[PDB]
From a paper:
Protein interacting with kinase C1 ([name]) is a membrane protein composed of a N‐terminal [name] domain and a C‐terminal BAR domain, and is expressed highly in the brain and peripheral tissues. It functions as an intracellular trafficking protein involved in the internalization of amino‐3‐hydroxyl‐5‐methyl‐4‐isoxazole‐propionate (AMPA) type receptors which are localized on the surface of neurons and mediate synaptic communication. The [name] domain of [name] recognizes and binds to the intracellular [name] binding motif on the c‐terminus of GluA2. [name]'s [name] domain is unique in its ability to bind both class I and II motifs, however, it binds class II motifs (i.e., GluA2 (SVKI)) with a 10‐fold‐higher affinity over class I motifs (i.e., PKCα ([name])).
We fused the class 1 [name] binding motif [name] from PKCα to the C‐termini of the [name] [name] domain to enhance solubility and aid crystallization. The purified [name] [name]‐[name] protein eluted as a dimer on size exclusion chromatography under reducing conditions indicating that we successfully designed an intramolecular interaction between the [name] domains using the fused [name] extension. The structure revealed electron density that confirmed that the dimer was locked by two disulfide bounds between C44(A)‐C46(B) and C44(B)‐C46(A) between the two [name] domain chains of [name]. However, because electron density for the fused [name] tail from the dimeric partner peptide was visible in the peptide groove, this method failed in allowing BIO124 to displace the [name] tail within the crystal lattice. The crystal structure that was obtained in the attempt to co‐crystallize with BIO124 represents the first [name] structure bound to a class I [name] binding motif ([name] from PKCα). The class 1 PKCα [name] peptide has an alanine at the −1 position and is unable to make this interaction. The second difference is between the polar and nonpolar sidechains at the −2 position. The polar serine of the class I [name] does not make an interaction to K83 in the αB1 position in [name]. In the class II SVKI, the hydrophobic valine sidechain at −2 position forms a lipophilic interaction with the aliphatic segment of the Lys83 sidechain in the S–2 subpocket. These two additional lipophilic interactions support the observations that class II peptides demonstrate higher binding affinities for [name] over class I peptides.
Residue numbers in the entry:
A (entry chain B), B (entry chain A): 18 to 109
């Protein structure tokens, strides 16, 4: 677990270019599921598939659904600071 | 949000071509993070990045580390059955 944050410029459609997963009844943690090609997320290159989302613009995501965190990100315009954890996976 | 199970054939390196996340303290649930190209999991089409792993060959991974989860897939030769939830994610 190496912690961080990064600020991504929204594109013209007010998207940074990620899907967020988790935040379900028994799975409190929130994760970046895909980084879509050719989006600001994709081009900065800090975050990746599998990284955990700990915060948006200086605010926890603790106990929120993926929708609520998706809203937290839409509502921010122009740029957005995604708090994360780079995480390991086990290949199989 | 849909439970299922897929039996897959191990390759010659006794692998199926997925990655595993979560399975950690404060982050109980376990996820498929990458599906690797030209591998059985990818060639099979059933599973995608972001789906929950919930069981293997009839056993529940409940409460295990991703290290342990990988152990359990690597143990079974020839083919392994993976129990999973197809999940969704909010795009931003």
């Amino acid at each position: 677990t190496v912690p961080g944050k990064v600020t991504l410029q929204k594109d013209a459609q007010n998207l940074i270019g990620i899907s967020i997963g988790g935040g379900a009844q028994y799975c409190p943690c929130l994760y970046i599921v895909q980084v879509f090609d050719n989006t600001p997320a994709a081009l900065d290159g800090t975050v990746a598939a599998g990284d955990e989302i700990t915060g948006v613009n200086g605010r926890s995501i603790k106990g929120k659904t993926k929708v609520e965190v998706a809203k937290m990100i839409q509502e921010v315009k122009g740029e957005v600071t995604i708090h994360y954890n780079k995480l390991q996976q086990s290949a199989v």
